[PDB]
Write an enzyme that holds these catalytic residues in place. Sequence first.
Site, PDB file in Angstrom:
ATOM      1  N   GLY D  12     -41.579  17.919  -9.120  1.00  0.00           N
ATOM      2  CA  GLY D  12     -40.884  18.857  -8.254  1.00  0.00           C
ATOM      3  C   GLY D  12     -40.003  18.187  -7.219  1.00  0.00           C
ATOM      4  O   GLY D  12     -40.019  18.564  -6.043  1.00  0.00           O
ATOM      5  N   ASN D  93     -46.274  16.669  -6.295  1.00  0.00           N
ATOM      6  CA  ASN D  93     -45.728  17.458  -5.197  1.00  0.00           C
ATOM      7  C   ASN D  93     -45.395  18.892  -5.592  1.00  0.00           C
ATOM      8  O   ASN D  93     -45.258  19.745  -4.708  1.00  0.00           O
ATOM      9  CB  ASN D  93     -44.472  16.766  -4.647  1.00  0.00           C
ATOM     10  CG  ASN D  93     -43.768  17.576  -3.578  1.00  0.00           C
ATOM     11  OD1 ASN D  93     -44.225  17.655  -2.438  1.00  0.00           O
ATOM     12  ND2 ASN D  93     -42.643  18.182  -3.942  1.00  0.00           N
ATOM     13  N   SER D 148     -52.900  23.752   5.513  1.00  0.00           N
ATOM     14  CA  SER D 148     -53.689  24.909   5.115  1.00  0.00           C
ATOM     15  C   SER D 148     -54.869  24.546   4.227  1.00  0.00           C
ATOM     16  O   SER D 148     -55.637  25.442   3.863  1.00  0.00           O
ATOM     17  CB  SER D 148     -52.799  25.925   4.399  1.00  0.00           C
ATOM     18  OG  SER D 148     -51.538  26.036   5.033  1.00  0.00           O
ATOM     19  N   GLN D 156     -51.779  33.884   2.673  1.00  0.00           N
ATOM     20  CA  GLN D 156     -51.902  32.732   1.792  1.00  0.00           C
ATOM     21  C   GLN D 156     -53.305  32.630   1.202  1.00  0.00           C
ATOM     22  O   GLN D 156     -53.791  31.523   0.949  1.00  0.00           O
ATOM     23  CB  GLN D 156     -51.556  31.435   2.529  1.00  0.00           C
ATOM     24  CG  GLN D 156     -50.087  31.284   2.896  1.00  0.00           C
ATOM     25  CD  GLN D 156     -49.870  30.301   4.031  1.00  0.00           C
ATOM     26  OE1 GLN D 156     -50.232  30.569   5.178  1.00  0.00           O
ATOM     27  NE2 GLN D 156     -49.281  29.151   3.717  1.00  0.00           N
ATOM     28  N   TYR D 159     -52.936  30.922  -1.832  1.00  0.00           N
ATOM     29  CA  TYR D 159     -52.288  29.626  -1.677  1.00  0.00           C
ATOM     30  C   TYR D 159     -53.232  28.562  -1.129  1.00  0.00           C
ATOM     31  O   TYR D 159     -53.381  27.497  -1.737  1.00  0.00           O
ATOM     32  CB  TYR D 159     -51.062  29.774  -0.765  1.00  0.00           C
ATOM     33  CG  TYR D 159     -50.395  28.472  -0.376  1.00  0.00           C
ATOM     34  CD1 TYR D 159     -49.602  27.776  -1.278  1.00  0.00           C
ATOM     35  CD2 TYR D 159     -50.546  27.949   0.902  1.00  0.00           C
ATOM     36  CE1 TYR D 159     -48.987  26.586  -0.919  1.00  0.00           C
ATOM     37  CE2 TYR D 159     -49.936  26.764   1.270  1.00  0.00           C
ATOM     38  CZ  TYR D 159     -49.158  26.088   0.357  1.00  0.00           C
ATOM     39  OH  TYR D 159     -48.551  24.909   0.725  1.00  0.00           O
ATOM     40  N   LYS D 163     -54.487  24.483  -2.318  1.00  0.00           N
ATOM     41  CA  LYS D 163     -54.229  23.286  -1.522  1.00  0.00           C
ATOM     42  C   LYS D 163     -55.528  22.591  -1.126  1.00  0.00           C
ATOM     43  O   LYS D 163     -55.600  21.356  -1.118  1.00  0.00           O
ATOM     44  CB  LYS D 163     -53.411  23.643  -0.280  1.00  0.00           C
ATOM     45  CG  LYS D 163     -52.274  24.629  -0.532  1.00  0.00           C
ATOM     46  CD  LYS D 163     -51.414  24.221  -1.728  1.00  0.00           C
ATOM     47  CE  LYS D 163     -50.553  23.014  -1.420  1.00  0.00           C
ATOM     48  NZ  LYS D 163     -49.773  22.606  -2.619  1.00  0.00           N
ATOM     49  N   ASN D 197     -40.570  27.529   3.655  1.00  0.00           N
ATOM     50  CA  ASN D 197     -40.613  28.172   4.961  1.00  0.00           C
ATOM     51  C   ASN D 197     -39.261  28.732   5.389  1.00  0.00           C
ATOM     52  O   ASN D 197     -39.082  29.057   6.567  1.00  0.00           O
ATOM     53  CB  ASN D 197     -41.120  27.185   6.016  1.00  0.00           C
ATOM     54  CG  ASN D 197     -42.508  26.657   5.702  1.00  0.00           C
ATOM     55  OD1 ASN D 197     -43.221  27.210   4.863  1.00  0.00           O
ATOM     56  ND2 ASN D 197     -42.897  25.581   6.378  1.00  0.00           N
TER      57      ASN D 197
HETATM   58  N1  LIG Z   1     -43.353  24.379   3.363  1.00  0.00           N
HETATM   59  C1  LIG Z   1     -44.276  23.405   4.026  1.00  0.00           C
HETATM   60  O1  LIG Z   1     -44.113  23.098   5.158  1.00  0.00           O
HETATM   61  C2  LIG Z   1     -45.438  22.809   3.269  1.00  0.00           C
HETATM   62  C3  LIG Z   1     -46.563  22.480   3.972  1.00  0.00           C
HETATM   63  C4  LIG Z   1     -47.643  21.933   3.318  1.00  0.00           C
HETATM   64  C5  LIG Z   1     -47.580  21.720   1.919  1.00  0.00           C
HETATM   65  N2  LIG Z   1     -46.466  22.051   1.216  1.00  0.00           N
HETATM   66  C6  LIG Z   1     -46.450  21.812  -0.178  1.00  0.00           C
HETATM   67  O2  LIG Z   1     -45.356  20.658  -0.507  1.00  0.00           O
HETATM   68  C7  LIG Z   1     -44.897  20.892  -1.720  1.00  0.00           C
HETATM   69  C8  LIG Z   1     -43.355  20.920  -1.682  1.00  0.00           C
HETATM   70  O3  LIG Z   1     -42.899  22.171  -1.183  1.00  0.00           O
HETATM   71  P1  LIG Z   1     -41.576  22.176  -0.240  1.00  0.00           P
HETATM   72  O4  LIG Z   1     -42.000  22.290   1.216  1.00  0.00           O
HETATM   73  O5  LIG Z   1     -40.822  20.895  -0.442  1.00  0.00           O
HETATM   74  O6  LIG Z   1     -40.602  23.482  -0.641  1.00  0.00           O
HETATM   75  P2  LIG Z   1     -39.746  23.603  -2.039  1.00  0.00           P
HETATM   76  O7  LIG Z   1     -39.295  25.029  -2.235  1.00  0.00           O
HETATM   77  O8  LIG Z   1     -38.547  22.705  -1.959  1.00  0.00           O
HETATM   78  O9  LIG Z   1     -40.705  23.152  -3.313  1.00  0.00           O
HETATM   79  C9  LIG Z   1     -40.700  21.800  -3.699  1.00  0.00           C
HETATM   80  C10 LIG Z   1     -40.547  21.654  -5.251  1.00  0.00           C
HETATM   81  O10 LIG Z   1     -41.461  22.307  -5.893  1.00  0.00           O
HETATM   82  C11 LIG Z   1     -40.690  22.683  -7.278  1.00  0.00           C
HETATM   83  N3  LIG Z   1     -41.442  23.573  -8.135  1.00  0.00           N
HETATM   84  C12 LIG Z   1     -41.914  24.800  -7.848  1.00  0.00           C
HETATM   85  N4  LIG Z   1     -42.541  25.260  -8.940  1.00  0.00           N
HETATM   86  C13 LIG Z   1     -42.456  24.324  -9.898  1.00  0.00           C
HETATM   87  C14 LIG Z   1     -42.916  24.278 -11.186  1.00  0.00           C
HETATM   88  N5  LIG Z   1     -43.670  25.256 -11.963  1.00  0.00           N
HETATM   89  N6  LIG Z   1     -42.685  23.196 -11.940  1.00  0.00           N
HETATM   90  C15 LIG Z   1     -41.999  22.143 -11.441  1.00  0.00           C
HETATM   91  N7  LIG Z   1     -41.542  22.184 -10.170  1.00  0.00           N
HETATM   92  C16 LIG Z   1     -41.775  23.282  -9.400  1.00  0.00           C
HETATM   93  C17 LIG Z   1     -39.605  23.221  -6.860  1.00  0.00           C
HETATM   94  O11 LIG Z   1     -38.530  23.238  -7.946  1.00  0.00           O
HETATM   95  C18 LIG Z   1     -39.207  22.261  -5.711  1.00  0.00           C
HETATM   96  O12 LIG Z   1     -38.386  21.283  -6.168  1.00  0.00           O
HETATM   97  C19 LIG Z   1     -45.460  22.269  -2.160  1.00  0.00           C
HETATM   98  O13 LIG Z   1     -46.394  22.102  -3.113  1.00  0.00           O
HETATM   99  C20 LIG Z   1     -46.090  22.869  -0.871  1.00  0.00           C
HETATM  100  O14 LIG Z   1     -47.296  23.703  -1.228  1.00  0.00           O
HETATM  101  C21 LIG Z   1     -45.372  22.600   1.875  1.00  0.00           C
END
Ligand SMILES: NC(=O)c1ccc[n+]([C@@H]2O[C@H](COP(=O)([O-])OP(=O)(O)OC[C@H]3O[C@@H](n4cnc5c(N)ncnc54)[C@H](O)[C@@H]3O)[C@@H](O)[C@H]2O)c1
Lengths: 256, 256, 256, 256
Positions: D12, D93, D148, D156, D159, D163, D197
């Site tokens: 991802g 990720n 989380s 969530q 969700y 995690k 977010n």
């Molecule tokens: N938003 C936050 O602040 C936060 C906080 C804690 C954890 N996370 C986690 O970090 C990770 C990255 O999320 P983000 O914050 O970069 O937002 P984001 O929307 O950019 O998601 C990151 C990547 O996940 C990819 N993705 C989603 N579903 C997929 C799938 N079935 N197959 C392959 N790729 C997929 C997306 O294409 C994207 O590139 C997530 O798993 C999220 O749960 C995010």
Amino acid sequence: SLLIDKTVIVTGASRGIGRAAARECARQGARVVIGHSGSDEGRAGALSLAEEIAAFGGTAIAVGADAADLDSGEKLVAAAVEAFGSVDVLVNNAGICPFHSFLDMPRELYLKTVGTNLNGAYFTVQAAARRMKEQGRGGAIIAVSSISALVGGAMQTHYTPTKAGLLSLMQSCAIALGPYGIRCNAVLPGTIATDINKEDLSDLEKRERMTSRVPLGRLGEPDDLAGPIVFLASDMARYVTGASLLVDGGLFVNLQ
Amino acid sequence: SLLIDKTVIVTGASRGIGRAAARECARQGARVVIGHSGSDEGRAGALSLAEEIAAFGGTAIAVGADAADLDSGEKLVAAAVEAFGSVDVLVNNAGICPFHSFLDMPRELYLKTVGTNLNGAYFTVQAAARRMKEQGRGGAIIAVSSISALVGGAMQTHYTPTKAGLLSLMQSCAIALGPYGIRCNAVLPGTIATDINKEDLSDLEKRERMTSRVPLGRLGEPDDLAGPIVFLASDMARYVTGASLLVDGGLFVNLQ
Amino acid sequence: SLLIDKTVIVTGASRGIGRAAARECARQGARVVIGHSGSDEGRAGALSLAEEIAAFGGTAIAVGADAADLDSGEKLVAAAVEAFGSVDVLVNNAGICPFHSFLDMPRELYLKTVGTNLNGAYFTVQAAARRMKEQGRGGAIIAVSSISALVGGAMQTHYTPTKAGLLSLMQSCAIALGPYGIRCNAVLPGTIATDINKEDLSDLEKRERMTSRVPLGRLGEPDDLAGPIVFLASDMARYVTGASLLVDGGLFVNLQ
Amino acid sequence: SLLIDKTVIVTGASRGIGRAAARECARQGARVVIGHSGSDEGRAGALSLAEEIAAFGGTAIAVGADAADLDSGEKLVAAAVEAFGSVDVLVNNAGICPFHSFLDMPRELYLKTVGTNLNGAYFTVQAAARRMKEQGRGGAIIAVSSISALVGGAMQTHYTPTKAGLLSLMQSCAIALGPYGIRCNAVLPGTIATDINKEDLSDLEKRERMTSRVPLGRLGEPDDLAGPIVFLASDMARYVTGASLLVDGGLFVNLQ
Ligand SMILES: NC(=O)c1ccc[n+]([C@@H]2O[C@H](COP(=O)([O-])OP(=O)(O)OC[C@H]3O[C@@H](n4cnc5c(N)ncnc54)[C@H](O)[C@@H]3O)[C@@H](O)[C@H]2O)c1
Ligand SMILES: NC(=O)c1ccc[n+]([C@@H]2O[C@H](COP(=O)([O-])OP(=O)(O)OC[C@H]3O[C@@H](n4cnc5c(N)ncnc54)[C@H](O)[C@@H]3O)[C@@H](O)[C@H]2O)c1
Ligand SMILES: NC(=O)c1ccc[n+]([C@@H]2O[C@H](COP(=O)([O-])OP(=O)(O)OC[C@H]3O[C@@H](n4cnc5c(N)ncnc54)[C@H](O)[C@@H]3O)[C@@H](O)[C@H]2O)c1
Ligand SMILES: NC(=O)c1ccc[n+]([C@@H]2O[C@H](COP(=O)([O-])OP(=O)(O)OC[C@H]3O[C@@H](n4cnc5c(N)ncnc54)[C@H](O)[C@@H]3O)[C@@H](O)[C@H]2O)c1
């Protein structure tokens, strides 16, 4: 009734959590020792609890003891054995939380909080544990630390380590006293509308914001800690030692 | 090299984890201040370490400061000021672990562990933080806590509260110091083969018992804590504060 | 008796922790709904348990509902509705632990543990919660998680995420359900001698190895989880929500 | 440079944390595999990262793979071995967080998040771990879970268990893969100003309240997670496995 013959030592039971814990213990059949600050506030509130306990048929004793004084633990058990013959439960609730900034913390203000909340507690649990050991019938030990044992507080750099140290104490004491049937646990109350938090709630400006953060939609009161403390002191928790229990109405998990 | 401009104060750097951490920081370009016991066994180790890093392009002094003496805070600050001009990273590492059973723990030895590991750390962090705020360029604090901050120890009932309080102190300090660019984090080392546990690990029939509990298959060495300490002190951890970092080879999670 | 008016739904109550919990609740005055596998080994145990509590003044039915089948949520709800009229306490206990190594874990067996311990629990909690909200009288949810929610298991890489997710679910649910008077908590049992680990504990040279790791000196029995589950389901835990409660005899803290 | 020959698989990595992690890996010498969603967004951003990496002298490959598709793990390693001959680091990720209320959660919305964030991750780490095992040279595994994993979230409930399950997975996988030099760890980012977010920050009403809660005085950006992830993948963390690391700017400890 959960403590029908167990005799319970509760420190700092003048007001707050300590008072409501000693009272509910008597309602469950315990023979309470109402420890207090040795001040005239402590002496007065303790008698009130002692008088209120015998009002519904219970029995209790008021004993003054400074938690900072490291001899208070053996005096509290000595009063308990002279009064009821045994020490079975210790609720180490005594503590202070003088809010103060960190970079200008006085050495005396810090050392008075470490001695009262941690150092004094360490030798109160020690003196109590010894009695439970040579009694040979087991026992329960409950330390009242804080939700701040798991998080921080900008004006509590001298406070939160003592509360996290109380938790860790119960964890190690659980190992040392395990083979003797002495279970040691900690309650971590959240925001309880007591005297420690009075200066913040007397503002009533962010009390509405304090309540906003609690998922149960209300602040804690001392009788919220009564149920959990007597549970940890009872046979309902015979296999529970080295554990903490959050009593906060969801405050810890409610991230914003 | 990730600590080029920074000036690092490492307490208890004469031997053990402190020595390896102070050595690796200077190889990352740091100006190290290896505090020690004031002992001549501690001074020689510090001076030897000072000469060691002097041999391949590093800078360091040696400041005897008893951590139990809370003036040592402003002492190590002024010594890093009067020689290097700034204090940018504090590694609070000085700590004792005198294994002893709980019920017969002397008051003197217990206060000696609290004062050396927690009280002296509080004001060492406070003194170092005041310089970081006065400079207004941010900073990093790193407390060497322990895996014992999350679990107990039967012969460490006096020891684990100091490490758990060290953790909680980093949490509360990360809040008060966060707005000033000062990050505060704790490293939680597992079983590290040093002289804190030379006698405890020379059972030679119990070392491999602890060793078999480490999924990585080996006990720790002070060099294993060097990498995590410099990382937390580096810009790689720009958004890391109020965090703990287990360096235990998987010991904590291994529910053997 | 502390569950007089309440109606309790206990999944996986045919044997093990679920049976003892469903038995103790009814002795506290509860109207129990002992769900089970739908197996006739599960039906007989439930019917036997139903007859057992019928023998000394209790009430209970038996509802075969596969937890892997997510319709079982609304099934157990309607069955407790169509016989008792209300649902006041949910004890989500149904779970499998098929010990298996990580790198050769079948997709089928892994999805069977996720669906049975987590997915089926989510909608079982959801279905039960919808009834508690519709009644508008509050309620209590209790998920039987594990000590494995805080530590790992080499042969439980498919199992410990479901229990850790069970913990996190109780946290997130305690927030969404808090304003509606619905408390949600997890109990974290240690090594309990049931049939989940009959073969795993019959090494007869490894049972005492796990036994020596318990400071209380003995493995758990399902009755040790009855006390903590009724407490969390009782008014003694009026301000307890989003919390976890280790019932492990000190296993977690014992850094052996 | 920390990964001078290690080849890193990042899932991802189109945008967000995954993108910034793959880029910093190349700046430290890694031979990156840029996994993405297989969508045209994923394909485009991955090429952009791949083009930007070779712009400063690095090398990388873009590979599309659906995390919900349980065969993506072995395809991602198959592409990595066909391209660089080895699999050494896995940054799992990929994940989604569709905010939704609990009591009206659709079964399809829940199961799509459990399959993408947990189930798909379980077999991506499995396929990657196997390669590291028969390679016989060790490896590192980093799962991006969340803050989380330690708290809750009202919207969530589907969700946060995934995690917390990712964390627990790294804990158990640390034990199973420990003897093979495969360290498994989790990063727990706080509030990172990403696309997940965006719907909350696009309001810009409580973004000012979001920032208020972070002690570092600012929100996270994906490059805040780059440093910590490559640290966990490097020899600086050779004794670090089964650990989590909060990258939140103090958000977790800042209780209000
Ligand atoms: N938003 C936050 O602040 C936060 C906080 C804690 C954890 N996370 C986690 O970090 C990770 C990255 O999320 P983000 O914050 O970069 O937002 P984001 O929307 O950019 O998601 C990151 C990547 O996940 C990819 N993705 C989603 N579903 C997929 C799938 N079935 N197959 C392959 N790729 C997929 C997306 O294409 C994207 O590139 C997530 O798993 C999220 O749960 C995010
Ligand atoms: N205010 C909260 O919400 C909160 C939250 C978590 C933990 N706690 C802890 O619970 C305990 C009880 O505090 P409280 O909320 O009931 O407020 P409180 O002001 O009523 O304090 C409770 C008791 O501590 C006594 N005490 C203080 N110093 C003493 C000493 N040297 N010797 C003997 N007794 C002494 C006081 O006389 C009082 O009776 C404290 O230790 C506190 O750290 C409080
Ligand atoms: N090695 C382990 O297994 C382990 C595990 C958990 C935590 N720790 C912690 O790691 C830290 C590093 O020490 P170590 O045990 O690894 O090596 P060590 O025990 O051999 O030396 C400890 C250092 O602390 C210094 N020191 C001791 N008392 C002092 C005092 N009053 N004033 C100033 N300095 C003093 C000493 O100069 C010494 O260099 C300790 O604080 C310890 O609490 C170690
Ligand atoms: N005994 C331990 O050491 C231990 C430790 C940690 C957690 N737990 C958890 O305690 C809980 C209680 O179970 P136990 O292991 O103590 O006793 P057990 O293993 O003997 O029985 C488990 C119960 O779950 C029911 N069950 C299993 N699969 C089901 C399905 N698809 N649908 C409906 N019901 C099903 C069974 O009817 C059975 O009564 C479990 O969920 C387990 O995860 C147990």
